[PDB]
Amino acid sequence: ADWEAAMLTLLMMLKVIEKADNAAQVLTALWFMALAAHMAALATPPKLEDKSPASPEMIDFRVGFEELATEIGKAIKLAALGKVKEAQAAAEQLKTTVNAHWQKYRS
Amino acid sequence: ADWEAAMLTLLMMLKVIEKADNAAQVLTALWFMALAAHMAALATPPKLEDKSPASPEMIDFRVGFEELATEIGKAIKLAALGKVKEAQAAAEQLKTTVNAHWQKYRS
Amino acid sequence: ADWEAAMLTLLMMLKVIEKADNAAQVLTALWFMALAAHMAALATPPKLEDKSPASPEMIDFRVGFEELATEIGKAIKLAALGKVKEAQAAAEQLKTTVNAHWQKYRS
Ligand SMILES: [Co+2]
């Protein structure tokens, strides 16, 4: 999928996560977040496909997206070890990270 | 997974999509479709594993499967921008494409 | 994701599978299992990251994880051809395999 679709999916699943009371739905949505990050691992924001592969702007985007995926994985492990509320705290921190990465290349 | 399992998953999720009233279940099933296409990206239909890698039949199969994945991504973006019904219209068009690709190598 | 998170996800989805009466939830959880195996395809158990890439211990781990993924795919095809209960029988056999692979490198 494209960058915008995946970022909106991440925000959607974050909305689904804060309204969760059991780790089942939590872990499900977190794995959907990791899924959306995996499908759009090479996607490019509409803001800057006309940039070179070794451009520091592009590398900024790439490492930020990797950061997203890594933070998702940490929250997934939290939701796997049983802790349904600590996973949601990590999910709100992830929401901060997702907000930043999206608002940087949203338009 | 194998080609047949993934194509039946696509048809199943298409059946789940037309009975949807909110973008949440829609986007969920569409991402499951993209997932099934990602897991079976190198799968071969039972009809023609005894073909060469550069055989135009095989390349036909490959580009058709890529077409499936791309059309799924477009429907996913539609279901991400909020439009739950335009996503279902794109999903019925995708159902046409999925029907063709499956009935070409079903047996 | 990491090995432990993915293995706990597999066990969780196995728990969700045995309580299933329709192939919809079955196939959904099985595809989540294949998803978790795909995300952690290169993950390393906490027990043995300090091993060489060509170490037979590491290769044992790798082929066992591939075995997990393959058995998941077989169960997914069973759950796709309509057979909701034969898929659950294959899922309990998969539970045996998952138990072994997890208890080998759990700590
Ligand atoms: Co992949």
- Show the tokens assigned to A42: 């090479």
Q: How far is the CA of A1 from the centre of ligand 1 (A)?
A: 13
| B80 touching chain A per CB within 8 A | yes
Q: How far is the CA of C38 from the centre of ligand 1 (A)?
A: 6
- Please give the DSSP secondary-structure letter assigned to residue A107: -
- A36 contact residues in B (CB cutoff 8 A): 31
- Show the tokens assigned to B1: 């997974």
State the CB neighbour count (10 A cutoff) for residue C104: 12
Q: What residue spans define the domains of chain C?
A: 1-107
| B80 touching chain C per CB within 8 A | no
Residues 6 or more apart in contact with residue B71 via CB below 8 angstroms: B90, B93, B94, B97
State the CB neighbour count (10 A cutoff) for residue A91: 26
The Cα–Cα gap between A2 and A40 comes to 6
State how far Cα B7 lies from the chain centre: 7
Q: CB–CB of A64/C52 below 8 Å? A: no
The Cα angle at residue B16 between residues B14 and B17, in degrees rounded to 5:
65
The Cα–Cα gap between C68 and C75 comes to 11
Q: How far is the CA of C21 from the centre of ligand 1 (A)?
A: 30
Residues 6 or more apart in contact with residue A29 via CB below 8 angstroms: A13, A16, A17, A20
The identity of residue A21, as a single letter, is D
**Looking up tokens 């993950």, which residue turns up?**
C43
Q: Which of B2, B8, B16 lies at the smallest CB-CB distance from C73?
A: B2
The Cα angle at residue C92 between residues C90 and C93, in degrees rounded to 5:
65
Q: In Å, how far are B43, B47, B101 from B37, measured between CA atoms? A: 9, 18, 13
The Cα–Cα gap between C68 and C46 comes to 18
Phi, psi for B99 (deg, rounded to 5): -55, -50
The Cα–Cα gap between A102 and A65 comes to 10
Q: CB–CB of C91/C99 below 8 Å? A: no
State the CB neighbour count (10 A cutoff) for residue B45: 18
Please report which residue ranges of A19-107 form alpha helices under DSSP H. Answer: 23-39, 56-80, 84-104
Q: Which of B23, B16, B2 is nearest to C22 (CA)?
A: B16
- Rounded-to-10 torsion of CA C3, A38, A41, B83: -160
Q: In Å, how far are A80, A94, A102, B40 from A75, measured between CA atoms? A: 9, 8, 19, 27
Q: CB–CB of A5/B76 below 8 Å? A: yes
| C84 touching chain B per CB within 8 A | no
The Cα–Cα gap between B34 and B46 comes to 21
Q: CB–CB of B72/B34 below 8 Å? A: yes
- Please give the DSSP secondary-structure letter assigned to residue B54: T
Q: What is the 3-state secondary structure (H, E, C) of chain C?
A: CCHHHHHHHHHHHHHHHHCCCCHHHHHHHHHHHHHHHHHCCCCCCCCCCCCCCCCHHHHHHHHHHHHHHHHHHHHHHHHHCCCHHHHHHHHHHHHHHHHHHHHHCCC
- Show the tokens assigned to A84: 């349904």
- Show the tokens assigned to B29: 């099933």
- Show the tokens assigned to B75: 């429907």
- Contact state of C9 with A76 under an 8 Å Cβ cutoff: yes
- C23 contact residues in B (CB cutoff 8 A): 12
**Looking up tokens 């921190």, which residue turns up?**
A93
Q: Which of A77, B103, A45 is nearest to C9 (CA)?
A: A77
Q: CB–CB of A48/A105 below 8 Å? A: yes
| A33 touching chain C per CB within 8 A | no
- A28 contact residues in C (CB cutoff 8 A): 32
| C58 touching chain B per CB within 8 A | no
**Looking up tokens 């795909």, which residue turns up?**
C38
- Show the tokens assigned to C30: 């099985």
- Contact state of B27 with A38 under an 8 Å Cβ cutoff: no
Q: CB–CB of B71/B94 below 8 Å? A: yes
- Show the tokens assigned to C6: 């993915």
The Cα–Cα gap between A6 and A72 comes to 13
State the CB neighbour count (10 A cutoff) for residue A65: 20
Resolution expressed in Å: 2.2
Q: CB–CB of B92/B61 below 8 Å? A: no
- Show the tokens assigned to A61: 């985007």
